[PDB]
Amino acid sequence: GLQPAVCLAIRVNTFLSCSQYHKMYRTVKAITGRQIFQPLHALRNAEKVLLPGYHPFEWQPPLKNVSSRTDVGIIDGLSGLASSVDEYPVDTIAKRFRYDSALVSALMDMEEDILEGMRSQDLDDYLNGPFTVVVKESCDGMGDVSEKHGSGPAVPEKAVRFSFTVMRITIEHGSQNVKVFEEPKPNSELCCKPLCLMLADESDHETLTAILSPLIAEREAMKSSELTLEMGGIPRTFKFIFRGTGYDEKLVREVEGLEASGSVYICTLCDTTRLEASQNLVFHSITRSHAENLQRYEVWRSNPYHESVEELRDRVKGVSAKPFIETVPSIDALHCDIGNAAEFYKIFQLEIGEVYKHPNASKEERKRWQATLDKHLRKRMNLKPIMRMNGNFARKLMTQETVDAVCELIPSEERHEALRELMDLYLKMKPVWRSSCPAKECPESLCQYSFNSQRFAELLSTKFKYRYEGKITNYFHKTLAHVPEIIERDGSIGAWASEGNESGNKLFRRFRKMNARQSKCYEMEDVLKHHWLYTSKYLQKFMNAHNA
Template sequence: PLHSLRSAEKALLPGYHCFEWKPPLKNVSTNTDVGIIDGLSGLNSSVDDYPVDVISKRFRYDAALVSTLKDMEENILEGLKSQDLDDYLTGPFTIVIKESCDGMGDVSEKHGSGPPVPEKAVRFSFTIMTISVPGSNGPVRIFEEAKPNSELCCKPLCLMLADESDHETLTAILGPIVAEREAMKTSDLLLEIGGILRNFKFVFRGTGYDEKLVREVEGLEASGSQYICTLCDSTRLEASQNLVFHSITRSHGENLQRYETWRANPYHESVEELRDRVKGVSAKPFIETLPSIDALHCDIGNAAEFYRIFQLEIGEVYKNPIANKEEKKRWAVT
């Protein structure tokens, strides 16, 4: 039986990787022999009349990361060699993880048998973007994902039969994943790569979310909201009057504070006043996403850039490249 095998023998089993966390992960089992687990284990026997054990399947986050690193063993050793670094380097290796989550649309089977389940699916996945080690002149990158948006390097962590708009099911399933991720932020992984025990630290970046899911997991109102932006507090009216200047001001921490304000209403304000104070945060944010420029702001940036080009065209700047400020202003209002 597996439990009586020695560590050396276990290491020879396909798909089995022995690893350890220092300090041990909070609220996560130290058992390393874990495969696919039930995404809703520990919850009641059914959710909205769906049998709970078929709603979601997932890997434990740390076990999935270890499995991916073992698959990349050759890349890591080649990276060390290509940077003229010692093969026996124990680390710490810093790994940047891109997290992604998106709805997969309608997955219904018209004539399939089996338990009745929601006909939409959501997938949470991760990609190892870079691996670096400390060098004498700062970090040295030994691996960088050449095609970060390819499905080949995007590792599925959790599949759930749920609608991405279903806040309750999403939080119930993704909650434990977020807890595991938070625990890994402050712990070091000890894993054998190339026959040597090495030390790994993880940095998580939640950039693979579309606007709909950012709003969902960061507690913002849905996309029809007057608070048009997931990056700043701008309203539709303000945004329509300002096509040039924007900065990223929203953050996960601020969203959490605003949710507490929304929940407690400490200043005893009316709903409208309170909504204005919290700028559209009305649910508890439960996943930290990394705000990155979205399609709306790319469009605005492009519009501003083209606007400038048109102004220069109007002024026929190619005929007079040394025009003064007054002249340029005149073109702008033409």
């Protein structure tokens, strides 16, 4: 006889839908005789414990501008937005959990992990000290989602997902704090818990803010409070630290009140122009923040010094909008890889034709360079040409074998050695801002990152004057200027990336196609609930019970 919790864990992790599980249950019962599995109603009853809105909790001091009820689950994401014909038209569907309810559900899920960590850390068990929780929030817009038929608004064909994950939990003991919980796979799909799923265009600022405002309000309300939760027979308190890193460049620019991606001020961490970045490229410092952006927007709106458009833009450093989401300045490792590898692809394309001797070239010649590069890349590294470049392509193109293959087409040897040494420098610099812990497994690489960055900058500025004279990519600027400072500030780059958010994005389509009701008014509720169940950690150790 199997328990309903075990049956639910199997049905969730083995990616089985309700209908398939029901027919498996009926055939197993009819053939074996005795009832091995459990009925769908039993599984449904056994899953309400894990969903948020079942466990009692009490905030102290009470959170501002939010209800104190502790029995709220899936609620409308529109948050009572006016849908009348006299108002701004709404065309979005959104279902969301309350932030505090989701966090208390996650904490009660990780209860036994926390207890095991306290036991293994040589501390006591019934300690109720001020537990500190570090939560990473990641957002990402999606495309190519097909709207369904049926009644409802003119929903767009794009989706935006908001998710959070729990990285570190600490408790204070004496004069120091111990490190009681760690996520073994911070970039996995099993850790990013969905929080709010909406079907809105990422560029539609009106509805984006309309749906994301209550979440930010709750975040600011609970940023300065204490949460008392009944945990294993002893009430324990919880503090929260919020870090938003899983935002790509476009989201950071849009939600931080910055300009578009091209612009002149390229970096989201320092207020330096593109020309100044191409002139120095090494020595910089992080200077942007949410409060600074708010003050700069206030200055832009007020115009207290009576300046023109260009002078006001120079004073405000490009902040022409009011930020509404607080994001910590950092670098997204996945998109950094994609951008750097695409730039390397263009470098190879230019180096095939020797642009350093032929400054003028035609579209046909560049297309022929594209064709020969694609042919030889396929021939050697077994890579097919792709119009929009992925991350596996970046990893397989960030090797010495592919640069040797490209050098098999470059007649000159100076270009061969230049590309070889530049590629070696890039491969030496990469493991610093990609490893989940770069102070332990790559100490020499972390120490030599600065020298390697200086060498890379000098090599670009000297040997590649036809590509990086007066202009350089913002991702190269970030990689060559800000990585060591971010390492010192945080502890790791890559553990805070958006790889887990991308994996959850992959899971979103599968859930929408297989484990959700095919209706425009319930699909996102079902997807959110199933994704929460899948990301729950109480249902994952039941599949790892064979190691006990």
